Enzyme design. Structure first.
Site, mmCIF file in Angstrom:
data_model
loop_
_atom_site.group_PDB
_atom_site.id
_atom_site.type_symbol
_atom_site.label_atom_id
_atom_site.label_comp_id
_atom_site.label_asym_id
_atom_site.label_seq_id
_atom_site.Cartn_x
_atom_site.Cartn_y
_atom_site.Cartn_z
ATOM 1 C CB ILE A 87 -0.960 0.017 1.202
ATOM 2 C CG1 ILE A 87 -0.183 -0.193 2.508
ATOM 3 C CG2 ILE A 87 -2.039 -1.039 1.023
ATOM 4 C CD1 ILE A 87 -1.005 0.032 3.758
ATOM 5 N N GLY A 88 2.153 1.109 0.250
ATOM 6 C CA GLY A 88 3.052 2.247 0.270
ATOM 7 C C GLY A 88 4.506 1.835 0.379
ATOM 8 C CG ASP A 120 10.030 -2.500 1.148
ATOM 9 O OD1 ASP A 120 10.046 -1.750 0.149
ATOM 10 O OD2 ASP A 120 11.045 -3.093 1.570
ATOM 11 C CB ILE A 121 4.007 0.410 3.995
ATOM 12 C CG1 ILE A 121 5.180 1.298 4.426
ATOM 13 C CG2 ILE A 121 2.936 0.361 5.081
ATOM 14 C CD1 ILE A 121 5.965 0.777 5.619
ATOM 15 C CE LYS A 163 9.978 1.200 8.201
ATOM 16 N NZ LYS A 163 10.324 2.457 8.919
ATOM 17 C CG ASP A 204 12.713 13.288 7.176
ATOM 18 O OD1 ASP A 204 12.744 14.314 6.453
ATOM 19 O OD2 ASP A 204 12.624 12.137 6.714
HETATM 20 C C1 LIG Z 1 -10.296 0.736 2.570
HETATM 21 O O1 LIG Z 1 -10.211 2.127 2.700
HETATM 22 C C2 LIG Z 1 -8.882 2.590 2.728
HETATM 23 C C3 LIG Z 1 -8.572 3.880 2.314
HETATM 24 C C4 LIG Z 1 -7.247 4.293 2.318
HETATM 25 C C5 LIG Z 1 -6.264 3.461 2.781
HETATM 26 C C6 LIG Z 1 -4.781 3.779 2.810
HETATM 27 C C7 LIG Z 1 -3.878 3.493 3.827
HETATM 28 C C8 LIG Z 1 -2.629 3.862 3.384
HETATM 29 C C9 LIG Z 1 -1.310 3.788 4.203
HETATM 30 O O2 LIG Z 1 -0.294 3.969 3.719
HETATM 31 N N1 LIG Z 1 -1.521 3.510 5.601
HETATM 32 C C10 LIG Z 1 -0.488 3.485 6.579
HETATM 33 C C11 LIG Z 1 0.828 3.647 6.222
HETATM 34 C C12 LIG Z 1 1.781 3.689 7.220
HETATM 35 C C13 LIG Z 1 3.253 3.855 6.889
HETATM 36 C C14 LIG Z 1 4.370 3.377 7.575
HETATM 37 C C15 LIG Z 1 4.445 2.429 8.760
HETATM 38 C C16 LIG Z 1 5.360 2.607 9.759
HETATM 39 C C17 LIG Z 1 5.415 1.696 10.770
HETATM 40 C C18 LIG Z 1 4.600 0.605 10.740
HETATM 41 F F1 LIG Z 1 4.656 -0.278 11.708
HETATM 42 C C19 LIG Z 1 3.719 0.401 9.723
HETATM 43 C C20 LIG Z 1 3.659 1.313 8.716
HETATM 44 N N2 LIG Z 1 5.456 3.769 6.933
HETATM 45 O O3 LIG Z 1 5.055 4.519 5.892
HETATM 46 C C21 LIG Z 1 3.761 4.591 5.864
HETATM 47 C C22 LIG Z 1 3.002 5.368 4.808
HETATM 48 C C23 LIG Z 1 3.689 6.726 4.600
HETATM 49 C C24 LIG Z 1 2.980 4.530 3.516
HETATM 50 C C25 LIG Z 1 1.326 3.596 8.520
HETATM 51 C C26 LIG Z 1 -0.025 3.452 8.763
HETATM 52 N N3 LIG Z 1 -0.885 3.436 7.807
HETATM 53 N N4 LIG Z 1 -2.743 4.361 2.152
HETATM 54 C C27 LIG Z 1 -4.058 4.297 1.781
HETATM 55 C C28 LIG Z 1 -4.540 4.804 0.387
HETATM 56 N N5 LIG Z 1 -3.493 5.093 -0.540
HETATM 57 C C29 LIG Z 1 -3.560 5.607 -1.762
HETATM 58 C C30 LIG Z 1 -2.227 6.333 -2.045
HETATM 59 O O4 LIG Z 1 -2.318 7.677 -1.891
HETATM 60 C C31 LIG Z 1 -1.338 5.694 -0.960
HETATM 61 O O5 LIG Z 1 -0.195 6.546 -0.809
HETATM 62 C C32 LIG Z 1 -2.161 5.686 0.093
HETATM 63 C C33 LIG Z 1 -1.678 4.886 1.307
HETATM 64 C C34 LIG Z 1 -6.573 2.192 3.180
HETATM 65 C C35 LIG Z 1 -7.871 1.762 3.164
#
Ligand SMILES: COc1ccc(-c2cc(C(=O)Nc3cc(-c4c(-c5ccc(F)cc5)noc4C(C)C)ccn3)n3c2CN2C[C@@H](O)[C@@H](O)[C@@H]2C3)cc1
Length: 280
Positions: free
Chosen positions: A13-14, A15-16, A31, A115
């Site tokens: 969804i984002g 290596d996420i 992550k 950052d």
């Molecule tokens: C069903 O309805 C929905 C609607 C929207 C979404 C939904 C949820 C996400 C998302 O990224 N979530 C997220 C990301 C991180 C994370 C971490 C991290 C650090 C530590 C951890 F332990 C785990 C993660 N590190 O980096 C990131 C980010 C910057 C990528 C942390 C928590 N949450 N995105 C969408 C929709 N996308 C379209 C496009 O714009 C995309 O960019 C965008 C991304 C999901 C469902």
């Protein structure tokens, strides 16, 4: 694919990766770090603050270190692009109030983020859709002792830890980052939202070193009054205040928030807490 005997790994969804907490039924963000521990301890120290994400699990899975976080939404950079790279003044001011408070909270817990950028602020999902979260403590650093509040010393010759586009001038000069620098970066973020770009954005060179010098040079040769020309004076006042802070100074967060609250009042905006991306 399952991590921690509890979470089902989903699509990137984002290596996420999107994940599913099998027992609870809720979705999470996962992550993966190839064989993160340091960052988990900072998240844990931050837990319990507004806009601080909760970590549900962290451990070892094969040749990967794993962290599992509550699922948040798109970043402010994502939403900026979704809004054709322009935010209304009201949205910028609503974001400014929350972002200043997030940075203040981190500082109250004895760390500097180092950052600050749109990609590290995420909106919540669902009932938290109006809440700005701050993420990514991989470059964060403790700046004072928790009990005595004794500050780390002034140092020079420091490498640029952060993103060049939003780095403070002092960061470009190799000075140890402190609280003032997180806030100056936020100042560039706010003008970035206003302008759609920054004057030093997109400058290229053969190597990173030359590129950073290019950005630093342009940042130093662009006075605040030129950067902020044609926008409410509060944005210049904010940036000038941040640049006036000394290395050890405690920022007046309340004064900075009041700048934008005052402008909010003079502009006549209503208290309906609706951001641009919900009202294209
Ligand atoms: C069903 O309805 C929905 C609607 C929207 C979404 C939904 C949820 C996400 C998302 O990224 N979530 C997220 C990301 C991180 C994370 C971490 C991290 C650090 C530590 C951890 F332990 C785990 C993660 N590190 O980096 C990131 C980010 C910057 C990528 C942390 C928590 N949450 N995105 C969408 C929709 N996308 C379209 C496009 O714009 C995309 O960019 C965008 C991304 C999901 C469902």
């Amino acid at each position: 694919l399952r991590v921690g005997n509890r979470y089902r790994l989903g699509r990137k969804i984002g290596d996420i990766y999107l994940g599913t907490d099998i027992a609870a039924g809720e979705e999470v963000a996962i992550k993966l770090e190839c064989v993160l521990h340091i960052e988990s301890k900072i998240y844990k120290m931050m837990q319990g603050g507004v806009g601080i994400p909760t970590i549900r699990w962290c451990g070892a899975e094969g040749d990967y270190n794993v962290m599992v976080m509550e699922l948040l939404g798109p970043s402010l950079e994502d939403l900026f692009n979704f809004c054709s790279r322009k935010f209304s003044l009201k949205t910028v001011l609503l974001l400014a109030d929350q972002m200043i408070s997030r940075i203040e909270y981190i500082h109250s817990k004895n760390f500097i983020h180092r950052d600050v950028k749109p990609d590290n602020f995420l909106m919540g999902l669902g009932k938290k859709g109006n809440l700005v979260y701050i993420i990514d403590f991989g470059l964060a650093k403790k700046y004072r002792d928790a009990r005595t509040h004794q500050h780390i010393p002034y140092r020079e010759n420091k490498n640029l830890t952060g993103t060049a586009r939003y780095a403070s001038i002092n960061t470009h000069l190799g000075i140890e980052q402190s609280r003032r620098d997180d806030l100056e970066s936020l100042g560039y973020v706010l003008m970035y939202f206003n302008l759609g770009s920054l004057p030093w954005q997109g400058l290229k060179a053969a190597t990173k070193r030359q590129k950073y010098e290019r950005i630093s040079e342009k940042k130093m040769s662009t006075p605040i009054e030129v950067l902020c020309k044609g926008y409410p004076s509060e944005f210049a006042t904010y940036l000038n205040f941040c640049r006036s802070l000394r290395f050890d100074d405690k920022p007046d967060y309340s004064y900075l928030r009041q700048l934008f609250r005052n402008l909010f009042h003079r502009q006549g905006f209503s208290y309906d807490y609706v951001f641009d991306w919900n009202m294209l």
